[PDB]
Amino acid sequence: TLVFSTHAVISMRDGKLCLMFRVGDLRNSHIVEASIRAKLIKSKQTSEGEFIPLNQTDINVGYYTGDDRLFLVSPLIISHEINQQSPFWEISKAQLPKEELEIVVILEGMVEATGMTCQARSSYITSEILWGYRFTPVLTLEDGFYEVDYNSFHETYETSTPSLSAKELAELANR
Amino acid sequence: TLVFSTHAVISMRDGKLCLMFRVGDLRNSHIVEASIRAKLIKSKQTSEGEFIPLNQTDINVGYYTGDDRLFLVSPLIISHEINQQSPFWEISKAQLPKEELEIVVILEGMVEATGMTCQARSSYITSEILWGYRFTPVLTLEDGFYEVDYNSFHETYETSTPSLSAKELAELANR
Amino acid sequence: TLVFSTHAVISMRDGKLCLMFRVGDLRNSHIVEASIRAKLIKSKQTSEGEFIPLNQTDINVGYYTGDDRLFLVSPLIISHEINQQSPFWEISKAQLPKEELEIVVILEGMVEATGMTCQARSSYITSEILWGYRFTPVLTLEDGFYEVDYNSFHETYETSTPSLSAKELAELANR
Amino acid sequence: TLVFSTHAVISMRDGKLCLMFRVGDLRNSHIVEASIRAKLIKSKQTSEGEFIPLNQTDINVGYYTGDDRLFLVSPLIISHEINQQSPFWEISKAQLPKEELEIVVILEGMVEATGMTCQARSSYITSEILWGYRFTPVLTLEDGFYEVDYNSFHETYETSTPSLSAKELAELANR
Amino acid sequence: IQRYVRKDGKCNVHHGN
Amino acid sequence: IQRYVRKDGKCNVHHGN
Amino acid sequence: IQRYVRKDGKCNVHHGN
Amino acid sequence: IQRYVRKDGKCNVHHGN
Ligand SMILES: [Mg+2]
Numbered sequence A, B, C, D: 001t002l003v004f005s006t007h008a009v010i011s012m013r014d015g016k017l018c019l020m021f022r023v024g025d026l027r028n029s030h031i032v033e034a035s036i037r038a039k040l041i042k043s044k045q046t047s048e049g050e051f052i053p054l055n056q057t058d059i060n061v062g063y064y065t066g067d068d069r070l071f072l073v074s075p076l077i078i079s080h081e082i083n084q085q086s087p088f089w090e091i092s093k094a095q096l097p098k099e100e101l102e103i104v105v106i107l108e109g110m111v112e113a114t115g116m117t118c119q120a121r122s123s124y125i126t127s128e129i130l131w132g133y134r135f136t137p138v139l140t141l142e143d144g145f146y147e148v149d150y151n152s153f154h155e156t157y158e159t160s161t162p163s164l165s166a167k168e169l170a171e172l173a174n175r
Numbered sequence E, F, G, H: 001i002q003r004y005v006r007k008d009g010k011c012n013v014h015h016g017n
Helices: A166-174 B166-174 C166-174 D166-174
Strands: A008-013 A016-023 A031-045 A051-058 A076-081 A101-111 A117-125 A129-131 A133-135 A139-142 A145-148 A156-158 B008-013 B016-023 B031-045 B051-058 B076-081 B101-111 B117-125 B129-131 B133-135 B139-142 B145-148 B156-158 C008-013 C016-023 C031-045 C051-058 C076-081 C101-111 C117-125 C129-131 C133-135 C139-142 C145-148 C156-158 D008-013 D016-023 D031-045 D051-058 D076-081 D101-111 D117-125 D129-131 D133-135 D139-142 D145-148 D156-158
Touching: A008 A133, A016 A101, A016 A133, A031 A076, A031 B117, A051 C139, A117 C031, A139 B051, B008 B133, B016 B101, B016 B133, B031 B076, B031 D117, B139 D051, C008 C133, C016 C101, C016 C133, C031 C076, C051 D139, C117 D031, D008 D133, D016 D101, D016 D133, D031 D076
Parallel strands: A008 A129, B008 B129, C008 C129, D008 D129
Antiparallel strands: A008 A016, A016 A076, A031 A051, A031 A101, A101 A117, A133 A156, A139 A145, B008 B016, B016 B076, B031 B051, B031 B101, B101 B117, B133 B156, B139 B145, C008 C016, C016 C076, C031 C051, C031 C101, C101 C117, C133 C156, C139 C145, D008 D016, D016 D076, D031 D051, D031 D101, D101 D117, D133 D156, D139 D145
């Protein structure tokens, strides 16, 4: 059994469009100085003529706000907000699948029990990002009890989501 | 005997409203690369319909100014300034107790003597945050002598403090 | 055999002028918390009269964007964008060679297999920076196969590049 | 024999007023992930009535520019630029000595040879900061040879320096 | 209201494997 | 389209030495 | 004025346990 | 012009002790 989301989701969170994915914890320990980071792998040719194959570019996940330093004790849903400075700013539902790209996700931290440091890498190909979905919750707050269902760790349902590019959605908003 | 503040306080510091708490040192060593960070745990449903239970959000404690990298050799009073970008911006004295939230506080650093790395976690529930109080000092500057009284480490007294929301206090200030 | 670019290149990338150099990976392991940083070594006398010999100054390589935290699994081309805040802002092709300076490049990370931490330093003297060149690609995307040719790791070709100072190029752009 | 500046200096560097101090290297090794940081220790009572004895506040040394991550292979002169956001903004030559404060300086890094991590702390009391001085150079560039004279490591000479507060100097500049 | 984290530092539990 | 990185975490290979 | 930290690096003391 | 740092990585020397 493993702990890292399989698919990624895109949908609305308080008006803004967001790219989301879950990240799993460790049963046998707490991770110190844990940090989540995510790169965007995708070839692109500079108008300048130079063709960079698999150029990488960083993806906002809370670097500026410090919200990329995780307190992982329970599965977390990392949420990228899709803004002007997002590489998906101009990508829409129908536009998604026909993108020749990939998202790498990297989790670093120093394990406590083991006194060693970990790095768990993973990826998502265009055909692994799900537009218009949200993650099934996996944390129920029972009577004086908080509990996770790792049986629903990957489970995702479908939600009403406009098929417009983040940029377009913000353009209509102005009107 | 332990070294991490029990309750948290909120009161004025040079006009601005602040959420405060003490953080203890280590007798047998100095901590290198020590860093204090604090998350805000609290469930909230996006107007969008998705209900996130125990969503976490980072809490300014000097990340931007670098003042979150501690020089801990004596008990310190970490002070969060409550600004527009504070999750308490709209919370007032009478509003406080009826909040279904929690503050997690995390201290990381590499111990010197032990050559190991530590992480001391702790929390505060709505019913553990004290509005209108300040921490009793625990560092007297005797004649050619600085000294702490860990007997007063948790001791807190009451101070005159307006029962308005940080936002409101700043709105009156404009007038 | 080694893994760190010999010469550095300067040319256009989407309009902006950039100082580039390649950085090699490790065959026998992945590097965690890998970070690329680069200093600018060069003596300069303050108009104030004080002469600082070999004063050092940091060089933007993605600190702000976080793009200086590398995911190194394949040779990467670190690209410094030459802006107002670049020490080369006012340097042009013909101006280059007659500069009494040096660029130090530093790569830090914790190796996985070895459980040790590395630092690979290197430099470039004025007579080792090549104006108007680009790095030969070293990553071909064969039929269901990505591959590097470390035989072309240092190989560089010549490209059309204006012989103006970054500042000047931006001044003409305004007109 | 040791490697950390004894006194600190304040004087002009390209118009701006700066607080300076030297920092020593290690003979037997290179330091990775080396970082210089500096706190300002000084008691102050909030207009609010609360008296904080030995409150600490961070001191700009290149955090924002990343210039606080040192490449230490030769004695370096850390230079704090005294700006609006400097705790010395309003302090002038004649004002200096009568200040009840102290500057702590902290150097952290992981040693290479020893595979251990260091922290070298040090301080400066009001009566240890020298106004109107500059550090004697300790790096001569002989014929095809760079060399340090640790005999001049602490040596400091006197330079023409206005006895105005950083704030005042900037106020005259406007006129 | 029940805690997510306890004063001492330990969390509140899961069920897997 | 072929991956650069695999779900498990391993990359896609080179030829040197 | 008495120091908080000494040139060598050691601090100034407490009383507990 | 003489280097401060050499391609391989080693610096340029001092005289103390
Ligand atoms: Mg570290």
